[PDB]
Amino acid sequence: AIKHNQQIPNNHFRKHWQRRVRCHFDQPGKKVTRRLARRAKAAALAPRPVDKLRPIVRCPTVKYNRRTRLGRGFTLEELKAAGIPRLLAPTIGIAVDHRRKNLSEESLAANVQRLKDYKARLILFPRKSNKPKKADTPKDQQTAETTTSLRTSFGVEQPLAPGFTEISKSEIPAGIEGGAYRALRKARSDARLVGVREKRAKEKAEAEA
Amino acid sequence: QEKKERLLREATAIKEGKKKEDVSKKPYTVKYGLNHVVGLIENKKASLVLIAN
Amino acid sequence: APVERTGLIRGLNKGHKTTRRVLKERPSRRKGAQSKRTQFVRSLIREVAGLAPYERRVIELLRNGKDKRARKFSKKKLGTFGRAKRKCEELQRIIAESRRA
Amino acid sequence: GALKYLEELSKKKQSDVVRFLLRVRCWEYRQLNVIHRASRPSRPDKARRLGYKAKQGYVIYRVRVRRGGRKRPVPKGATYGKPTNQGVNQLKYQRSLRATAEERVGRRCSNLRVLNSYWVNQDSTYKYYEVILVDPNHKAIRRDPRINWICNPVHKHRECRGLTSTGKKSRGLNKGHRFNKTRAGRRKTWKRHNTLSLWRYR
RNA sequence: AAAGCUCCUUCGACGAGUCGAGUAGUUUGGGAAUGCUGCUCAAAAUGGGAGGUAAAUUUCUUCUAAAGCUAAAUACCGGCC
RNA sequence: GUUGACCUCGGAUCAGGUAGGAGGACCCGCUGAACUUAAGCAUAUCAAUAAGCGGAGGAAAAGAAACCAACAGGGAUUGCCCUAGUAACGGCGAGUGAAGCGGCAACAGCUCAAAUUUGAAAGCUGGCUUCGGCCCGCGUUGUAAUUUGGAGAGGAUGCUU
């Protein structure tokens, strides 16, 4: 029953909503539990970091197309290029993505650089102390300052390419021959008429011959 | 009975240095098993086939 | 191999310029490919089991007859137009080989 | 190798060879009980494909179902409701005859677990199914790690909870834009969409 | 004895009364029909499904169903504190 | 004729085992209303809810794509914020109403059928044993190793574990 000028109401309170009301009165309490779990996890993994290396990835829509972010795992082709055994990779903390594939060559190049400088920064204790092997650490460059986050030490350096640059005058290029607004209009109309134009051309050639 | 003694015989031969395939010989036996026999005739290795009814 | 992109959106070949590459074929895309062992089995079983009722009807309809009834009948029985075409074209082969035989 | 030929032959359920064979075997049934033991599978390939093995502890049962739609059980025809739901005589059950068949056999054999089931024969007024069951208390089962996952107290009577292959079908458990309202459980997502959440700092 | 890596002429088996279609009822925001179930018909090998408007012709993209297992982030004061 | 096997169906207070009931706040299914709103009322709404029935655990369920997209492409499942009171449904009335992308919590991958070990059923329940083995039985209408699409099999070649 409207009485004055108001906005037409629509409040979806017509079922028995009172039977399903969730209140978050334990927001601080949960936080404490999560922190206790992290410390326990950190103590179990004594000298290793907590997280696992992720690759660099570009967002998948036309919007958000500009930014980059972390992925889920490295593709099988990326691992082979860096020279890493397929099965040893998960053990030493590098992840693996069963179902991603590389179409271009910049993401491929970016990720192999990531692996290469990681392997240079990786220590590797032997499986038994009394018998070291050839691929282990020689026990003398084995004491150094370590990291544990591996998200801050290996996060995206810059998601968005630098906003602006500077160039000397008389080096600025020239636009498209006729304008840059006529270029868009022409490129649009061409795709609108692709079907009709090709059909008309084809009929004339066959009919004449 | 024959298999157990045969495996014992070749075991006592491997312990003085002589390798296997020297006390025994190539065996000739009949073949059986439904899928097994199908392979033997798919490969054109069989000579006669007897089927139950 | 792959064509290049024009470098401006809202066009006939829009995109952002990059160097597309060719990538080796995945073993998951060879699904519906003919293999030289399955064909042996199917030929043997076909000659052991024989034909089906609706199959026999379209044979006699196809031979010594026109062809629009055959396609209409096959679709009504099989369900879709695409499968009907394939069955008729394959079925034509078996009758044709017998005549040549 | 021969098992491949069997798969290819059983696909042609209309050829004269196959059609005659079913006609005789279906008479063999319908003279026995509605539920009874089977000494060995009648479709060895279809049984092997579903996990059946040949070793002590695996059993095969055979069952018959009434077939046809479900009539609403109500005294005479009265429903005492609104006209939008007062039909009685064209309604359909919301599960498959396979599930009903599996459930009855499970109640019969209360000390085994139900693995799967498959179709064997069919008439105007009956449908015949064969059910594969496993013994969870046999030592030969507890020894093998490919199956002993079923001996855990969380897989009790899963036929009647909807966890076999036919049960997963009659629920909407598949990925994609098509199975939206039932991907993770119809009741669960209804609760999620219909709850009202309030935080401390609104 | 068993295992891992680099190269190759050539091979490379992959789930049926199921998929799909017609029809009826129910349900969903799903609209020439989103899922489920009953009845009738009932497939194929570069095949098959999907690409949110029914149909024909010609291209393209992405996966590989009809067999199975597995902790954590989530719900709850019914039980013991 | 006698004798000895096989297949199917039975008896036994035979040897050894297993399920029912309770609880049901939370979870997985089936079946299934009306009061009420529409200022009347039948489609609609209350509601894919209450009552009834079946089945488990400390969590349950789901899960390693027959996915989303139309990008310079993402990559198991679960949960919170946002998308969004939006696309859409509706005597187009009252009303109802999702999903992709994005940030975070937590992260973990795998096994079977379809192949002939065929130069040797290499496999397993039970009973007895002194612990080394033996006996009957299951099983060739297929029990172990090998392979699961990321591949793999078959060939060379030199390293490493």
UniProtKB/TrEMBL annotation, chain A:
Q: Does the keyword Hydrolase apply?
A: no
> Bias category Polar residues: which stretches?
140-152
Please, which domain of life does this record's source organism belong to?
A: Eukaryota
GO process terms (BP): translation
The record's annotation in InterPro entries points to: Ribosomal_eL13 (IPR001380), Ribosomal_eL13_CS (IPR018256)
Q: Where is this region: Disordered?
A: 126-168, 192-209
For this UniProt entry, the molecular function terms from Gene Ontology, in alphabetical order, are: RNA binding; structural constituent of ribosome
Q: Could you list this entry's UniProt keywords, alphabetically sorted.
A: Ribonucleoprotein, Ribosomal protein
What Gene Ontology cellular component terms go with this record?
A: cytosolic large ribosomal subunit
What does UniProt give as the signal peptide span?
A: none
One Pfam family named in its UniProt record: Ribosomal_L13e
Family under the similarity heading: Belongs to the eukaryotic ribosomal protein eL13 family.
Which HAMAP family does this chain map to? Ribosomal_eL13
Q: What is this protein called?
A: 60S ribosomal protein L13
Query: Which organism is this protein's natural source?
Result: Chaetomium thermophilum (strain DSM 1495 / CBS 144.50 / IMI 039719) (Thermochaetoides thermophila)
From TrEMBL, chain B:
Q: Which domain of life is it from?
A: Eukaryota
* Family the entry assigns: Belongs to the eukaryotic ribosomal protein eL8 family.
- Describe the task this protein carries out: Component of the ribosome.
Protein name per the record: 60S ribosomal protein L8
Species for this entry: Chaetomium thermophilum (strain DSM 1495 / CBS 144.50 / IMI 039719)
TrEMBL record, chain C:
Q: What is the name attached to this protein's record?
A: 60S ribosomal protein L36
One GO cellular component term: ribosome
Q: Where is this region: Disordered?
A: 1-38
One annotated GO molecular function is: structural constituent of ribosome
Keyword check for Ribonucleoprotein, yes or no: yes
Which residue intervals are annotated with compositional bias (Basic residues) in the record? 13-34
Record Pfam families: Ribosomal_L36e (PF01158)
Q: Does the keyword RNA-binding apply?
A: no
| Keywords, sorted A to Z | Ribonucleoprotein, Ribosomal protein
Q: What is a biological process (GO) this protein takes part in? A: translation
What family does the database annotate? Belongs to the eukaryotic ribosomal protein eL36 family.
From TrEMBL, chain D:
Does Ribonucleoprotein count among this protein's keywords?
A: yes
InterPro entries found in the cross-reference section: Rbsml_eL15_core_dom_sf, Ribosomal_eL15, Ribosomal_eL15_CS, Ribosomal_uL23/eL15/eS24_sf
Positions annotated to bind Mg(2+) 1: Y80
Q: Name one Pfam family in it.
A: Ribosomal_L15e
One BP term from GO = cytoplasmic translation
Residue ranges of the region described as Disordered = 164-185
Alphabetically list the UniProt keywords. Answer: Metal-binding, Ribonucleoprotein, Ribosomal protein
Bilayer-crossing residues are none
Quick one: which residues bind Mg(2+) 2? Answer: T84
Q: Which PROSITE patterns match?
A: RIBOSOMAL_L15E
Task: List all Basic residues biased stretches.
Answer: 168-185
In its UniProt record, a GO molecular function of this protein is:
RNA binding
Q: Has UniProt tagged this entry with the keyword Metal-binding?
A: yes
Question: GO terms for CC?
Answer: cytosolic large ribosomal subunit
Q: Which family does it belong to?
A: Belongs to the eukaryotic ribosomal protein eL15 family.
What protein name applies here? Ribosomal protein L15
Natural source organism: Chaetomium thermophilum (strain DSM 1495 / CBS 144.50 / IMI 039719) (Thermochaetoides thermophila)
